[PDB]
């Protein structure tokens, strides 16, 4: 899956 | 006072992301759209108020605020993040609300498209009369 933000 | 009672309804979350034709301007990469709704086209609006989903920061107004069905907010982005989805219900005491922390996941360009339902039973031990007819339709 792509990138995660926080 | 010899009897009790517990209501159980049923609520579906999800969402679906897929990747754009072609980026927005910004780099948004996929198109998704996260919702709540009842199993089987029930009418949840009976009983619940309004839907909350708390957005991730980055978005204009991430407070999306639905109060009648459909209760989904359709969005362009490039990551995926935790929603709070906060479903308010046609009730006066305590529960008022319930909270779910919803994983708004993407997939990678190349990768299937994502199709996410997750199932959520919520009980209301001996609610009021008022709520319990509407919770039962």
Same mark, same amino acid.
């Given at each position: 899956?792509?990138?995660?933000?926080? | 006072?010899?009897?009790?009672?517990?209501?159980?309804?049923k609520?579906?979350?999800?969402?679906?992301?897929?990747?754009?034709?072609?980026?927005?301007?910004?780099?948004?990469?996929?198109?998704?759209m996260?919702f &709540? +709704?009842?199993?089987?086209?029930?009418?949840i609006?009976?009983?619940?108020?309004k839907? @909350?989903? *708390? #957005?991730?920061?980055?978005?204009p107004?991430?407070?999306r605020?639905?109060?009648?069905?459909?209760?989904?907010?359709?969005?362009?982005?490039?990551?995926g993040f935790?929603?709070?989805?906060?479903?308010?219900?046609?009730?006066?005491?305590?529960p008022?609300? &319930? +909270?779910?922390?919803?994983?708004?996941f993407?997939h990678?360009?190349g990768?299937?498209? @994502?199709? *996410? #339902?997750?199932?959520?039973?919520?009980t209301?031990?001996?609610?009021?009369?008022?709520?319990?007819?509407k919770?039962?339709?």
């Amino acid at each position: 899956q792509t990138a995660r933000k926080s | 006072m010899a009897s009790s009672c517990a209501v159980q309804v049923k609520l579906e979350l999800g969402h679906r992301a897929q990747v754009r034709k072609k980026p927005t301007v910004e780099g948004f990469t996929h198109d998704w759209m996260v919702f &709540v +709704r009842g199993p089987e086209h029930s009418n949840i609006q009976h009983f619940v108020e309004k839907v @909350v989903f *708390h #957005l991730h920061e980055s978005f204009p107004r991430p407070k999306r605020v639905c109060k009648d069905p459909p209760y989904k907010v359709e969005e362009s982005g490039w990551a995926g993040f935790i929603l709070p989805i906060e479903v308010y219900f046609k009730n006066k005491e305590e529960p008022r609300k &319930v +909270r779910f922390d919803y994983d708004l996941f993407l997939h990678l360009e190349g990768h299937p498209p @994502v199709n *996410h #339902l997750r199932c959520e039973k919520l009980t209301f031990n001996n609610p009021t009369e008022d709520f319990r007819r509407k919770l039962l339709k």
